[PDB]
């Protein structure tokens, strides 16, 4: 085989967290980029079972809107993760401040958000946290989902399970996640896209939670659009919000027909 081809150089980090520490590791031979997770199993009961199930996933996954896996290998407590590196950084640094971006585009990224997410469902598997620091990019501003950490298989053999489990991001969570005690998982995803929207299209999150005790948010039910956070986004697309955060789960658009959409279909814009 080739020589030195397993030894990958730690330029710099590409985050930093309580999950580990990705860092980009570049090759030593071909300077082929990658990033490298290298999460911590400590103690004696916590994430020795959260990482293998990452792990255990991250092995189904293949598409080219979603972080691209390579493998893994245990040193026993730093585990190291080698997934898809991006030179686009994160969805999240392309968000302007009260502004959101060209329109043009979030149809763009909104498209490859449904890929993955269409993808994954497609294999029954909900990511359960979605978000623009978690949406890559890459060198041709393609969208690639990322962070399976909290995902999980909602359907195995054409049985969907129904979930229970309260773990997300409080804004950009689903409202019946906060209500009912169990419920649907596919769903709970496509609301949590319909914010990554707006908060495209509007550079701002639209609340803090789903929850009837949270101001602005009960203005969106009673259609007050007017001039609100909701006023930076045209018809075209805030007609889709109406029909996308909606508060029964049991009447949200799904993807099949957020692609029928039609501002979902609309050129350029
Ligand atoms: N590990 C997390 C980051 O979340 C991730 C979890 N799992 C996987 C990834 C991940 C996977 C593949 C990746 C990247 C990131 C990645 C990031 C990147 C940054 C800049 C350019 N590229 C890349 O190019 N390929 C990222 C750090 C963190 C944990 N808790 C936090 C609280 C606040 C801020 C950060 C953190």
């Known amino acids: 085989a080739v020589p030195f081809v397993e030894d990958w150089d730690l330029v710099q980090t ?9 860092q980009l590791a570049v090759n030593r031979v071909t ?44 040193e026993g407590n730093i585990q190291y993760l080698f997934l898809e590196y991006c030179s686009g950084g994160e ?72 979930l229970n489990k309260m773990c997300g991001t409080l804004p950009y969570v689903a409202p019946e996640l906060l209500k009912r005690r169990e419920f649907h998982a596919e769903p709970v995803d496509v609301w949590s896209c319909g914010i990554v929207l707006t908060a495209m299209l509007a550079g701002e999150l639209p609340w803090d939670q789903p929850s009837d005790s949270c101001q602005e948010y009960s203005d969106w039910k009673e259609k007050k659009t007017y001039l609100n956070p909701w006023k930076k986004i045209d018809s075209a697309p805030l007609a889709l919000l109406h029909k996308i955060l909606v508060e029964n789960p049991s009447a949200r658009i799904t993807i099949p027909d957020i692609k029928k959409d039609r501002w979902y279909n609309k050129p350029l814009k």
């Open 14 to 22: 590409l985050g930093e967290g309580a999950y580990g520490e990705v």
């Open 91 to 162: 969805l999240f640094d392309r968000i302007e401040p009260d502004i959101g971006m060209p329109e043009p585009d979030a149809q763009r990224f909104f498209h490859q958000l449904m890929a993955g997410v269409v993808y994954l469902h497609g294999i029954g598997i909900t990511h359960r946290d979605i978000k623009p620091e978690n949406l890559l990019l890459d060198e041709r501003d393609n969208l690639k989902i990322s962070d399976f950490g909290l995902a999980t298989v909602f359907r195995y053999n054409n049985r969907e399970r129904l």
């Open 31 to 74: 300077e082929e980029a990658v990033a490298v997770k290298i999460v911590d199993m400590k103690r004696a009961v916590d994430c020795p079972e959260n990482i293998k199930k990452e792990i255990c996933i991250n092995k189904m996954l293949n598409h080219e809107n979603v972080v691209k896996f390579y493998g893994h290998r245990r």
